[PDB]
Design an enzyme around this catalytic site. Structure first.
Site, mmCIF file in Angstrom:
data_model
loop_
_atom_site.group_PDB
_atom_site.id
_atom_site.type_symbol
_atom_site.label_atom_id
_atom_site.label_comp_id
_atom_site.label_asym_id
_atom_site.label_seq_id
_atom_site.Cartn_x
_atom_site.Cartn_y
_atom_site.Cartn_z
ATOM 1 N N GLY A 1 2.023 4.448 3.845
ATOM 2 C CA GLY A 1 2.161 3.082 3.519
ATOM 3 C C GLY A 1 3.374 2.804 3.300
ATOM 4 C CB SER A 2 4.586 -0.744 1.901
ATOM 5 O OG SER A 2 3.708 -1.359 2.943
ATOM 6 N N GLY A 3 4.982 2.085 0.357
ATOM 7 C CA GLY A 3 5.564 3.154 -0.778
ATOM 8 C C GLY A 3 5.826 4.218 -0.497
ATOM 9 C CB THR A 59 -1.179 -0.077 1.091
ATOM 10 O OG1 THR A 59 -1.750 1.161 1.079
ATOM 11 C CG2 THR A 59 -0.319 -0.348 2.396
ATOM 12 C CB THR A 60 1.952 4.221 -1.462
ATOM 13 O OG1 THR A 60 2.432 5.234 -1.464
ATOM 14 C CG2 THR A 60 1.569 3.997 -2.953
#
Lengths: 203, 224, 224, 224, 224, 224, 203, 203, 203
Positions: G128-130, G1-2
């Site tokens: 998020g992860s990005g 997710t981002t």
């Protein structure tokens, strides 16, 4: 375990392999994992036996109660949402269960609910230890232009594939197609075996 | 005023007064047939702005058990809902509802409490449960004191006495479904035909080996 | 004094006396149209220091369901707030409010309790709920005993009887929105036009496939 | 004696008797001006040993909302403190008090409960809340039954009727602050000038975009 | 009998009857001086076997606040102890008792509850609190309904009226400590000198910047 | 009947009626001497099958504090046991019982509650506590309302008035132990010698710097 | 997710990639993470599926209730503050969720609420992860002098960038612009694809 | 921290160094650790800041309440005993505090209460991280034949010694002598500095 | 984070850097950490975002309530003491927060409250991850003979110093001086930047 739900046109099909394990050591060569949960929705189990049954008994009763009070079947997105809420509330003494519920209320659906109550709808989804395998074959050969017959056959192919490469999966496949027109109908063993032989997945 | 406490003649007047309240309701009745049971109610319809069909007085408890109620409408609703959830409890515990007798007793106990305790009037409603269980077709009655009696045919509400006498004479134990609803409607007629009208009753039946079927407007008038 | 306990003639006088209290309120009424439902209330405005519009007696429960109330104002507020939160509960559990019938029943049960138990008088207010659910347009009524009835048109308050008779004769089931509010206002007129005044009612409507629209001052006077 | 339970004519006599109790209080009144609201109270001062200023009957709830009370002094205190903490709750939950309407409702609900339940008499006090929120200047009234009405000007206590009539005739909606307090004091005069005295009232005002300003002894006498 | 519920004339007779009970007590009074406050009580001593000094009716709440009480002795004790612990609570929370006004309000609220609720008679005692806080010297009064009023001088008990009138005429606001206690004793005299005796009162004073000083037997007789 | 609620003349009749009940008890009395305190009770012995000595009405609370009781025997027992455990609580918290005043107050508070609350009659018993604490010899009295008074000599029960007058005239504050018990027995005599009998009282004394000594049958008759 | 929220002028835009994962193994190629939560505020999810949904259902209902009682929309700083308080109160059985909420009440805003209920408003923010990746490109190319069109295009660039360098992110970007003038409006898939191609982020 | 209580004749003296730490990193060069807790008893703190304050506020209020109800000061052995009971009751969410309380009720006393509520009276006692050091010098140079002046000077010597060899201790010494005759009186800073210089502990 | 409170004459100044982090990865280049908490007292935050906000909302409301009931502002030593008690009571599900509160009630004060509810007043104090650095420069250049202007400038120097040597600190400094005479007044950004340039801490 491996279960599969495929949504197409105005039907959804759901199939499971039947085989519990329960040590490693496979103790039941015929469990039950696909369960009708309402006249227009069925739900497939792919986690831990005990827990998973309890969500089923709960769900049978809870949709049945609903249907009676409101005089109408509960929507899929609703049973989904409800199931999420149930799981999420006791997520610190959690069920270790991976649930897939599909049904047809106004269009077909297939929702995947994880152990923590996250429900996301997709056009196909599998759950369980042979999960990756059916995702392989589906991702190559799924088309949303399929009819029920092609549907059931894509299902059968996929689950047979899973069995071969995953030793936790196995045992006589059973499939149910749920449509608006015929209701929820679970295909009899004789119909399925014929389909194996034909597709040449027989040995 | 008064409360459930015993009078000098051994009666719980609050319960007696409860029973009066059920008598002031709308008539409904039921009886077993060859292989099932039927519930048929009078419809308290007089206004044309009332939504006909939508007001159902035969309510389902579970796919294979219905109850039709008489008395104060409000208390009937709540108590009906008590029964629904209690049915569901057995489904989640045991796997199935193996005895309708049980289902009706639990609901009975609830009413018996409000008839025991102070700080609470009795539940002023009567109901009859019918359905088929593992034992077979069952017709049960439930009273404000919690009393339960098992019938072949029974009545409730305003035409309680009236309908009772009709049934007392003319009831034949194994009767085919068709003839049966007719007998019902005749019994309901004699009674309720004192305003010289009856309109269309709401009719439901269940047969062994299947679920409850609630009839439609058009069907009923044929037996009418 | 008296409490909810049954009288010797099978009546809960406290409930009866409750019903008297709703009769002493302000009139409000509603009815379904072709594809929606409308709620139109009399405005208990007589002082010029009262803030007109700000006092709303048609209150929203949820974007697609409103209720207009009659009776003791205070109890109406609280009970209205009970309903709001109960709607929200269904949204958080199930994802949506799929039946307004349910919503009205839960609120009904609440009132039925205060009519069962001692140490607590009944809730002395009446309300009608209207809105559109998955089933379609629904108009419901709610009474002090917890009683619920489903309408096509219904009334409440002082002009209960008055408005009832008007509607009883002149109501046509499928009517376009416009003609409908007019019929409303005519019915509200006959009644409330006994002081020889009516002023401007507060009017709301909903149509299938959209949200509740509460009208403005200027609009209403055109149908007036 | 009597309790909140409905009389045979649909009235909660305990509430009625409550309302009598507010009537036996000290008069206080309020009204909106061009861009704010004012609260001005009569001062129940007659002894010279009483500490004048220290006894405040216009009490602040929050920097931007005050309430002036009438009725039993004791119950007014507690209920005033209920309101203070309830305001604070909204500040800690939401970040701000975005509607004074809300604040007054919550407090209203509290009073409505003690009017519902037995084992507890109603809260016998009346109050008016004024302040400016995101919506703008608001003047609210609160009654023993929990009733709330939104005003432009309103009164309470002994000179309730008296002050009401004054305001009913001579109130102009947009008036500058100065002229406004004068109008107040004239209205308070007519009434309370039946002992042929009035002394100095306690006066507070708020204007949009700022906090409550409670006047001082010396100022008030200039408008006196 | 009777309970706190409102009478038909807007009065809580149980509270009224409470107030009667305080009137049947022993007189005590207090007033502020130049830089402190004093409390001086009549001593309900008539038996010679009573331990004189040991029975103190001016009791300390905290080193810098005392209260002298009138009414039922028993209820006064408990309520006095409520106050002590409540003072201590503020010391443990906030670090100090910054307002005696607060201290007296909390205790007031306690009494207001027993005047609200049934299943409990009101607390039938009156008390005056005096002390110096951050604000300065404060004299407060507390009534059975929970009512609080801030004084310069006030009285309680049997010589309530008597002492009140004395003070009403002859009180000078800034008076040196000495002259002040004298004024007290004169006021207490007029009143209590109806048996033609007074004996020695118990006298306490506090001055800003120090703690409460409770006088001794020998001192008092000099001002006597 | 009646409950603790205030009568129209400012009295708690249930408490009054309680006090009547203590008056119908057995007489007991006490007084301080030079360096200790004594408790001496009449013995409600009339049957010869009663176990004399075994029935003790002077009961110890702690080695250095005794209480002798009058009133309903049953309530006296329980309340006596309340006191015992309360003493023990202080021993476990603080290390010692540094004030008998405290001990008697806590027990007093208990009685005051049952005199406040409904759903509970007052505790109908009277008691006097005596003992020596850090302060020195103390004699305390306790009444049904919870009232506490500190004595040099005091009485209770049937010979309350009688014994009171005796003591009122003939009590000398510092008296040696011997002369003291004699004075006691003379006071107890005058009173209780109206049946023209007295038999042997039960006698206890404590002196500073030691524990309670309960006398024996043979000793008492020498002072008799 | 981002997810990404960009505040500019009198609008805020919020976009998310649509892709759940749910093993590693990416199980949904089209989840939902941007959700309208009120007629003038939307909220983006970037933590753990289950938990995150529950905060959403809660929030929908809670702002809806508010709006009804007070007859006015809840301020952004208020929904923010409220959400913080909710999270902070059960921070020892914590949600592992990173929430971004933007909306326009009187000016635009974008608040970032972490898992422990800390809410700090900034002029742009991702979660998020990005997260790092979009922060890169934004920190180079964000200007508060941008109009909506430039806005949406900066968003699209940034999210495309995230997808490339982060294998947890991926899947068809969806964007919603929330303005005072048109309300909250979520841009249709067709509008977005056109914008990809144009910006030459297409392959 | 280091605190010291010395009982002698008809007085007790108690002194502390004033210095909190609070990282290691010494953050306060003037804390408070010796506190009057009643008109005839003072109490010294030597554990953990937070906890230790709470026992003090408690104790101030609790002896104050007592004194009022009984019209007399609470004995030392009583305040001691009471404090033990308080600590012992919640010894599984324990205070990590080492408390010394001295005062004069009928004779002087100095009780040492550990973290678990053990109170043992001794004729001198120290607490805290420089505990051993003052115990050294006291064990050499304490005599119970000392007067107050000699008392204060023995105290000063001891605490100066502690500071030198323990880096947690430090900061301007403050002493209070509590006697029956003058009450509790805390010696002013000027009096103490003079005494340092004289004893030649100055640098 | 780093915050600083300096007490001098009849004023106290409090300044913070504005910068949240929130990963490591600095996610907000403008947080808020100095907050007015009463008309005559402000409070600075230097711990963990979530927790720290909650103490602030609490404190705003609690002093506001107080002020209303008693008609007077709460003393500094009182708000301090109160805050200690709050923290200490739930010190086993503890806030990990380091709070500094200064204000002027009758004289200026600056109290430092740690995570466990220990509050010790000092004439200057810092909190946070750049804590040591400002303590360096203050310990060299603080004098209590300073006026406000010199005050603000000593503050600015110190915080600039912290930023340089601590990578968690950073971002535009904001200062508030709280005096009895002008109330609490927070210096506008323009005033501060001018002061940087002048002191030659600009780059």
């Amino acid at each position: 375990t491996t279960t599969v739900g495929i949504t197409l046109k105005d039907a959804v099909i759901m199939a499971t392999e039947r085989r519990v394990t329960m040590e490693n050591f496979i103790m039941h060569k015929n469990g039950k994992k696909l369960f009708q949960i309402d006249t227009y929705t069925g739900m497939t189990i792919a986690g831990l036996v005990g827990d998973a049954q309890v969500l089923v008994r709960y769900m049978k009763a809870e949709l049945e109660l609903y249907r009676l009070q409101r005089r109408v079947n509960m929507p899929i997105e609703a049973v989904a949402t409800l199931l999420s809420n149930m799981l999420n509330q006791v997520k610190y003494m959690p069920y270790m269960v991976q649930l897939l519920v599909g049904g047809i209320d106004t269009a077909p659906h297939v929702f995947s609910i994880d152990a923590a109550g996250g429900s996301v709808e997709d056009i196909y989804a599998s759950t369980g230890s042979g999960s990756p395998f059916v995702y392989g074959v589906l991702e190559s050969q799924y088309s949303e232009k399929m009819t029920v017959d092609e549907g059931v056959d894509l299902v059968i192919r996929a689950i047979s594939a899973a069995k071969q490469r995953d030793s936790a999966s196995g045992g006589m496949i059973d499939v149910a197609v749920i449509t608006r027109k015929d209701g929820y109908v679970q295909l009899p063993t004789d119909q399925i075996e014929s389909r194996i032989r034909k597709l040449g997945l027989i040995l | 005023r008064a409360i459930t406490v015993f009078s000098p003649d051994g009666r719980l007047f609050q319960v007696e007064y409860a029973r009066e309240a059920v008598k002031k309701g709308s008539t409904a009745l039921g009886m077993k047939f060859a292989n099932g049971v039927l519930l048929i109610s009078d419809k308290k319809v007089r206004s044309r702005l009332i939504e006909q069909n939508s007001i159902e007085k035969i309510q389902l408890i579970d796919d294979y058990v219905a109850a039709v109620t008489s008395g104060l409408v409000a208390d009937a609703r709540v108590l009906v809902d008590f029964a629904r959830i209690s049915a569901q409890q057995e489904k989640v515990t045991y796997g199935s509802l193996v005895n309708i007798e049980n289902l009706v007793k639990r609901v009975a106990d609830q009413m018996q409490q409000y008839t025991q305790y102070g700080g609470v009037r009795p539940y002023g409603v009567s109901l009859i449960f019918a359905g088929i269980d593992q034992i077979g077709p069952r017709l049960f009655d439930c009273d404000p004191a919690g009393t339960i009696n098992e019938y072949k045919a029974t009545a409730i509400g305003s035409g309680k006495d009236a309908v009772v006498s009709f049934l007392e004479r003319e009831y034949k134990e194994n009767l085919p479904e068709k003839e049966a609803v007719t007998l019902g409607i005749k019994a309901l007629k004699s009674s309720l035909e004192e305003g010289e009208e009856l309109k269309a009753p709401e009719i439901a039946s269940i047969t062994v080996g299947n679920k409850y079927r609630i009839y439609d407007q058009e069907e009923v008038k044929k037996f009418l």
